[PDB]
Amino acid sequence: NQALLRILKETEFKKIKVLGSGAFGTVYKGLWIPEGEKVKIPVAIKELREATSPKANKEILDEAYVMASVDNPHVCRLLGICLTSTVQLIMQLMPFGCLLDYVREHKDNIGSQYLLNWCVQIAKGMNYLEDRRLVHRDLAARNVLVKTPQHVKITDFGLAKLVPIKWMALESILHRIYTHQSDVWSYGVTVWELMTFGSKPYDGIPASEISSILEKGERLPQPPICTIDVYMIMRKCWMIDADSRPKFRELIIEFSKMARDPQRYLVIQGDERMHLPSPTDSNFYRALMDEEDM
Numbered sequence: 305n306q307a308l309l310r311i312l313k314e315t316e317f318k319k320i321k322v323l324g325s326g327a328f329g330t331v332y333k334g335l336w337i338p339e340g341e342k343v344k345i346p347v348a349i350k351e352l353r354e355a356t357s358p359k360a361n362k363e364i365l366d367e368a369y370v371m372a373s374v375d376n377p378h379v380c381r382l383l384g385i386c387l388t389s390t391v392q393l394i395m396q397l398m399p400f401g402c403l404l405d406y407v408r409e410h411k412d413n414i415g416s417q418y419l420l421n422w423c424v425q426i427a428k429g430m431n432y433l434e435d436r437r438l439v440h441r442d443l444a445a446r447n448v449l450v451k452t453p454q455h456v457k458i459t460d461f462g463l464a465k466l467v468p469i470k471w472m473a474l475e476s477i478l479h480r481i482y483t484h485q486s487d488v489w490s491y492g493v494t495v496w497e498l499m500t501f502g503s504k505p506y507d508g509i510p511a512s513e514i515s516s517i518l519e520k521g522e523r524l525p526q527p528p529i530c531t532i533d534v535y536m537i538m539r540k541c542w543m544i545d546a547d548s549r550p551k552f553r554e555l556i557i558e559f560s561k562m563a564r565d566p567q568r569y570l571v572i573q574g575d576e577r578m579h580l581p582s583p584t585d586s587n588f589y590r591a592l593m594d595e596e597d598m
């Protein structure tokens with residue numbers, strides 16, 4: 305149970321470079337130095353921006369014992385925690401960054417086979433969080449990490465204790481109701497982010513007014529690379545009836561169907577010039593960075 309969350313000493317890790325921030329904390333590239341060893345292992349460290357108390361920290365250690373409990377290839381597991389005056393969370397390092405920045409930076413080189421596979425993988429991790437009765441509350445392309453280009457993982461889960469209005473389902477904005485189906489709404493918006501190559505949803509619409517335009521029946525438009533088959537699925541994620549939104553287990557299957565013939569469903573200029581890596585190149589990544597089961 306508590307055998308998955310390691311409590312760390314200040315003296316056995318070091319923060320070396322600022323990699324990004326969030327809403328409750330800044331993320332650093334770090335180094336883990338085990339006691340009595342001469343190795344320095346790269347980690348990812350999240351320092352909480354607001355300073356907590358000694359009892360605030362029993363609350364943290366309760367979601368930190370759960371966050372360290374996720375055992376899923378497409379969800380990032382909390383590994384360790386360091387209980388300072390600003391609690392520091394230790395996790396595995398992803399040098400490729402988040403999927404949001406990656407798609408902006410590689411948009412001219414991303415084919416349909418990658419994108420559809422990511423959506424399969426994202427929904428697999430989220431279906432796991434549903435299987436684990438864990439509602440994420442902040443699924444977005446920025447909180448999806450890229451282990452290798454062929455393998456993504458979801459991160460930043462544990463923020464109810466601690467607002468991305470443009471990703472939240474209508475009932476969250478109106479009533480603060482967060483369920484697995486409102487994570488489906490967040491998922492459909494994340495798929496939009498991928499399919500538009502990192503565009504900002506509702507760009508120029510103030511967040512204070514989005515709950516209104518949603519109630520009038522307005523949604524995000526069809527991404528130019530998307531066929532209607534893909535967009536209808538996204539549209540089904542944004543239904544005002546939460547129960548009518550698709551389930552993650554169904555989002556997995558359908559996007560699996562689309563990944564077996566990717567060029568029918570996403571029309572990208574030059575899509576014939578970019579394919580998945582040969583089994584040679586897939587094994588090369590996996591032996592070097594990505595040895596887990598799937």
Ligand SMILES: Cc1cc2cc(n1)-c1cnn(C)c1OCCC[C@@H](C)CN1/C(=N/C2=O)Nc2ccc(CN3CCN(C)CC3)cc21
Nearest residue numbers: 323324326331348380395396397398399400401402459460
């Ligand atoms: C398990 C784990 C690992 C990691 C993050 C989280 N969790 C996590 C947890 N909650 N939240 C909000 C999280 O994400 C934080 C948001 C940005 C994040 C992608 C940073 N980020 C990174 N993240 C992780 O390792 N790897 C990165 C590699 C490259 C760059 C870009 N260069 C950096 C230097 N500046 C100049 C910009 C250019 C950014 C990188």
